[PDB]
Amino acid sequence: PNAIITAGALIGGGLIMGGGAIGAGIGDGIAGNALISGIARQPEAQGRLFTPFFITVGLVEAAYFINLAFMALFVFATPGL
Amino acid sequence: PNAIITAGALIGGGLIMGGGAIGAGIGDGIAGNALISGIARQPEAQGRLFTPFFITVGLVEAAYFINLAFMALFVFATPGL
Amino acid sequence: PNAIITAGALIGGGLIMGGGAIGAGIGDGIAGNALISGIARQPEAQGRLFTPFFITVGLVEAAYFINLAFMALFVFATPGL
Amino acid sequence: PNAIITAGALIGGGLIMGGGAIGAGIGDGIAGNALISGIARQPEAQGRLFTPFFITVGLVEAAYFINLAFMALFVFATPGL
Amino acid sequence: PNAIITAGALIGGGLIMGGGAIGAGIGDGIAGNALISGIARQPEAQGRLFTPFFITVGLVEAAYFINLAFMALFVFATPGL
Amino acid sequence: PNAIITAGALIGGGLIMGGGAIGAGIGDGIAGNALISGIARQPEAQGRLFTPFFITVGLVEAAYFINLAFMALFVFATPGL
Amino acid sequence: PNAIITAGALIGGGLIMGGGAIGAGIGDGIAGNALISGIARQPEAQGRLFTPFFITVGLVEAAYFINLAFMALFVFATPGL
Amino acid sequence: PNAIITAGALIGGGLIMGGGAIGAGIGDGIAGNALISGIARQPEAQGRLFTPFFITVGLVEAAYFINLAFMALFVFATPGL
Amino acid sequence: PNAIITAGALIGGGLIMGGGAIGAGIGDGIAGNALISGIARQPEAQGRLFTPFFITVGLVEAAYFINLAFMALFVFATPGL
Amino acid sequence: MSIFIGQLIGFAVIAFIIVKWVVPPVRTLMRNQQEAVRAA
Amino acid sequence: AIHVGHHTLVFELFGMTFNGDTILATAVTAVIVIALAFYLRAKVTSTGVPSGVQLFWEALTIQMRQQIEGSIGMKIAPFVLPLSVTIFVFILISNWLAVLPLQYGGGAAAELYKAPASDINFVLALALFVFVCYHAAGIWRRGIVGHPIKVVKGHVAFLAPINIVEELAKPISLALRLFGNIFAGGILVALIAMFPWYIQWFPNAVWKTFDLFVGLIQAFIFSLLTILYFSQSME
Amino acid sequence: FLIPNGTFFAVLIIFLIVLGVISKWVVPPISKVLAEREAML
């Protein structure tokens, strides 16, 4: 019974981290695209843009790491089981 | 019987947190792209841009956290046992 | 039999909310990108940009909540059970 | 035999709605981004942009709600049951 | 025997329709973004932009319809059943 | 044995068509966005623009139709059946 | 044994081919957007944008065709049995 | 036991390849969009833009090619047999 | 039982790597789009643009590699085995 | 009854919302339109 | 559990089955629309300050005429104005009437008035009437021989197979967009009915407002797509 | 649920009746009112 629950938890965690990776990568890429476009526009603005950029990256990584913690819950502390 | 239901609930919760992370990361990245761009064009606009930002993020993160709650449902209070 | 149907309903509801969360988050982020960019370009336009924004949100959030409905149908009122 | 078909129909309808909601949310967000940007650029656009906008939404919602109709067939009137 | 085939056909049709809806909704939203932006830039464009637009929409929704057709070939008819 | 292989072939063909339709719809929408934007910005380039457009669509649709070719092979020929 | 392996191979090949289709279609659409826009802004660039374009497409197609090959290796040949 | 692990490995390798192909195609298209836009704007920029381009592609394709190796590991010499 | 657990772990690791590859490819492409656009706009700013670039990449690739690490845990450690 | 009471309370909440935030603006618009017609 | 269909007051006549609840809801919305129309007639004035219903009718007619003139002038399509307007109100009043507190407990949840759009028959009637009407308009303007030719030809000739299908899609979607939007809601508000009243009250308020918003949006979209179909079929 | 029945006609007739009342006693009077407003200025 556990083997079925364990396989289900592994698949669930795989989806968990796959979605986390997609969201994190794409959101960070978009934020960095904005940062690079802003610095090309105004190369002296590199210092100013790190605050909004790091706020956006912090939000995206908070989502990613909360999801990675829930994968850890699924895999190492599988609910139920 | 319970093992199959638990495995299905774990797979469902993994799908929900995965989609939620995709949505949250990508939407937050898209919103932060506008934030960083606008602050690059208008350095002083920061004050007025964090209100539309946290509003939109407030929506996007909401879509995330709702999912989180329901995923706990799926995994801790899994209906249909 | 009810165990298999319950597992399938849980997986289906997980897919429903994964898609709904992706759509809602990404659409809210895309609309917020326009809102932030417009308020950066036109600070006085904020009041006028909320009506196009909250309409757009009102659409995507609707698509979210409709999904939230049919998840609750799948999970709490599993058709065919 | 009916339990397997019911679980498969639930999963299929979940996929239908996941795709429909992803499409609806993202397309509505994109259309609203266009609407908000156009109204920010030229405020009086408020009048003329709701015609092409609600056409776009009308196209974005169709693919969603048609799927929803075919969801009801899958879930409530499973073709192969 | 036919139960497994029917469940697989339902899942396949759900995948078909979910992918078709994602493609149609997102492509229609993207095309309507250009339509709305063009009409905002030039109200007279209202007249001439529907020809490029409705070509796109139609090509974008072709894939939706063909997919839909084959979904009708999956759940109502069923190869190998 | 044939039932399981047929269900797997149906699921695989559904995945193929879902992915093909996602790609086709989104790529056609993206190409038509450029077509509409160019025709709005330069009305006289309509005929000038349908050449690079139908080429790109021709590429995108090609990717779609190959996939359709394979889906038939999956559901009607079903290699390994 | 061969039935389960063949069903898994069909599902895996469908995933390969559908993902390749999504990537190819969306990348071709994105590259065609740049091609069409550049040709709109520059009639002459028609000749010179085909070199950056077919290179990009060459990459976008490459990842597609490789998948196709592996998809064949999944379905016609079977690495397991 | 070996058949189940083989089917799971085939499905996992298919997921790996689908994800790698989506990432590769879409990233290559996005990079080639910038390349084509820059070469349309400035035609003499070609030689300058192939270094930023092939770096990006080098990263993008790298993520793709890694997924190949692990796919082989999943497909050939399946772990946990 | 390990057979089921190993198959589930393989599917989960495949999902992890598929999501990681999608995120890495798309984010790297998006960041390189900004890099190419900036280096086209400001040829002399390459040095000031590569630092934001490799930062952005350093984020998205991290999300990839972290996922990869956990893939190994799923594929070689198999925590629930 | 419980379903009826719950949906009635929801209807009351939405009615209050529209009366306090949607009725005022629409009403203005109606009055301003009437005033414009009278002035014309 | 939730039920789909299960129409009440269902009867049989002339060899055909009729959903009594759907017909009753359609009749209620129709009589409300007719009452509004007759109150305007009784209180319509151009020499004096307009009435509230007069202002509403003027605004709706002005909007619909603005959409018509911007795509197909009323010198060519004057008949689509009385159509696009009614389709709006008939739908709008149909949807907003579902916002009244007419839901109760059987213990399965039930509603005295259920939105007509939630029935496939209502949406199909409206959509197929629009389909027939604008196809007749296209036949009139282009001729019975030229109208099918230009329909198949479309804007791009070699895309003919993608044209005909789209033409058959217009009605279905036009119906399915309206039905799915409202039918879905009929399930959500039923699902909310599973909550206890002290938890049920808030979700109904939130959804009801969406139902108001989405019903208005769907009426507008349905009417505007009807006007667009007329613009396309009338050259 | 998706299969139509006689209601398709029953609704249609009612709609037509509405389409009559609006097309006669609403749209023409409102068009007359708007035309007179335009002529007044």
Ligand SMILES: O=c1c(NCc2ccccn2)c(-c2ccc(N3CCOCC3)cc2)c1=O
């Ligand atoms: O709604 C409307 C809708 N499509 C929504 C939908 C339905 C089914 C599946 C997916 N999406 C259309 C529509 C109308 C015409 C059209 N062209 C005419 C010119 O030649 C090319 C084709 C294309 C689209 C709506 O109007």
